[PDB]
Amino acid sequence: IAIALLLLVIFYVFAVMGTKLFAQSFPEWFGTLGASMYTLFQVMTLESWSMGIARPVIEAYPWAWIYFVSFILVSSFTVLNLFIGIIIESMQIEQEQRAHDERLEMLQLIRDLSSKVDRLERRSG
Amino acid sequence: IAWIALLLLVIFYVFAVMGTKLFAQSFPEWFGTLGASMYTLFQVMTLESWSMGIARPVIEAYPWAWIYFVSFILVSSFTVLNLFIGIIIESMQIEQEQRAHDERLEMLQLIRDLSSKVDRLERR
Amino acid sequence: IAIALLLLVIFYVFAVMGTKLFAQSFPEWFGTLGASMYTLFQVMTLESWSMGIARPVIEAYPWAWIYFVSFILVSSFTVLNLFIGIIIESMQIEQEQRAHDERLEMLQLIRDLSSKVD
Amino acid sequence: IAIALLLLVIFYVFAVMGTKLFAQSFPEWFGTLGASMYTLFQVMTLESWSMGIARPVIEAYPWAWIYFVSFILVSSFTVLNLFIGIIIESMQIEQEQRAHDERLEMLQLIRDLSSKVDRLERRSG
Ligand SMILES: [Ca+2]
Numbered sequence: 417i418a419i420a421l422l423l424l425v426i427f428y429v430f431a432v433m434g435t436k437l438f439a440q441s442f443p444e445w446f447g448t449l450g451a452s453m454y455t456l457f458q459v460m461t462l463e464s465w466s467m468g469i470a471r472p473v474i475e476a477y478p479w480a481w482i483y484f485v486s487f488i489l490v491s492s493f494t495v496l497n498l499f500i501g502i503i504i505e506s507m508q509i510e511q512e513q514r515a516h517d518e519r520l521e522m523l524q525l526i527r528d529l530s531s532k533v534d535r536l537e538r539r540s541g
Numbered sequence: 542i543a544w545i546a547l548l549l550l551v552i553f554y555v556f557a558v559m560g561t562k563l564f565a566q567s568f569p570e571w572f573g574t575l576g577a578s579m580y581t582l583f584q585v586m587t588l589e590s591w592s593m594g595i596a597r598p599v600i601e602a603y604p605w606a607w608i609y610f611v612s613f614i615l616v617s618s619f620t621v622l623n624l625f626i627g628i629i630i631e632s633m634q635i636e637q638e639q640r641a642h643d644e645r646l647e648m649l650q651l652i653r654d655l656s657s658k659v660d661r662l663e664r665r
Numbered sequence: 666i667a668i669a670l671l672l673l674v675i676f677y678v679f680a681v682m683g684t685k686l687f688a689q690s691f692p693e694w695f696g697t698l699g700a701s702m703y704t705l706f707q708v709m710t711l712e713s714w715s716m717g718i719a720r721p722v723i724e725a726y727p728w729a730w731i732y733f734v735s736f737i738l739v740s741s742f743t744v745l746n747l748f749i750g751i752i753i754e755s756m757q758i759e760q761e762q763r764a765h766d767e768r769l770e771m772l773q774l775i776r777d778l779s780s781k782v783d
Numbered sequence: 784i785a786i787a788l789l790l791l792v793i794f795y796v797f798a799v800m801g802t803k804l805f806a807q808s809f810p811e812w813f814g815t816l817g818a819s820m821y822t823l824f825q826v827m828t829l830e831s832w833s834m835g836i837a838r839p840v841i842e843a844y845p846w847a848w849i850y851f852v853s854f855i856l857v858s859s860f861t862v863l864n865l866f867i868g869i870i871i872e873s874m875q876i877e878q879e880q881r882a883h884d885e886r887l888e889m890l891q892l893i894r895d896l897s898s899k900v901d902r903l904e905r906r907s908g
Binding site: 454457458461462463464468499502503506507511514515518519521522525528529532533536 | 589590592607622623629630645646652659663
């Protein structure tokens, strides 16, 4: 699962970028982290990300063409890997070492017996 | 998995009663009653115009809600993450594992029996 | 996989319902199967299903409150089961049965030793 | 995983179609690959694909009824198969022969004991 960190870096970073870039023009979505976070959560969610944010951004900032497309990909490519990361961390460790406690003592037991039958081998001398 | 089914129907239930408490004054449309707060939260659950269409417009008068929506979404998707995957595991489908701790944990018993049988014939 | 049928029944049926119901008021989305199919594909997709279709429907038809919510659920619950239906239809020794030839004879050996007895 | 190619063909192709078709009427979304790529990414994303693009296209091009519905299906059916393609690939040692070092010597030990008891039960009557 924890990516969870990475994701909260990506999420963190992209916001600070956006708030740097756009906040001048788009204080609505990008004036502060306060809304850049939301906005990128909203973009993460795919609720009116282009038609509602990106295209309208890009109407004055063509460079953002990538900022939105990128973040979406990057985001979904880590949530691809975290959603599947809990598919594997749910599908199974321990069954190994409890029968090396048995066997590596059962052996010890037979050495004990062998020197107890052999203690009555010393036993006649 | 369907232990969650309950939980989810609590989350779903609860969040609605909150919203209907909060917003219904301002947003009777989406929040006037459970009747529509249930829908609305289903709709927010669905991610069809949740922010642009509900939340941001809520938040225009209630900055409080900033979390109410973001939260519910997360909470919801994190239980449906776990229920959808809960049906991935409840669908997917051995014994010889505990059958060699029945061997070893009796083979041991056998060597103790021998050790007190070799030891039983030591006194003699 | 083939549910594929069922789904195409659900999908089929719900359209014929909607086109019966709404087409009067909402010929836009429901005037014919032609657009009721699309519309229900669009509702299946969760692109402006409520805000864009359902709520606006329901503004004159409160009965639809279920028609949309229902279809969505029903749909996702069959696509839940078909997408997972391809997760299972897609997921396609002696080292374990040997250590019960060593052990179930090593035992025999210790019984043989133990019947070392006067 | 790599479909990744196929997908980038589908994605590529459909854009060139759309840009052929619509870029007369809808230079907005279809004037160049530049925006037909985005647009098809946006349609891939299911953010206002019909209500925002397709229906509005189709208001003048009933042809497109399929172009959108098709691409969506085709897209999601390859991403169905690539997302599940990573459920099987990045999802799905030695202790095996380490307990035949134990067992195939523990046996040796019991033969050693058996000829050691053979030693002294013989050697004590
Ligand atoms: Ca949507």
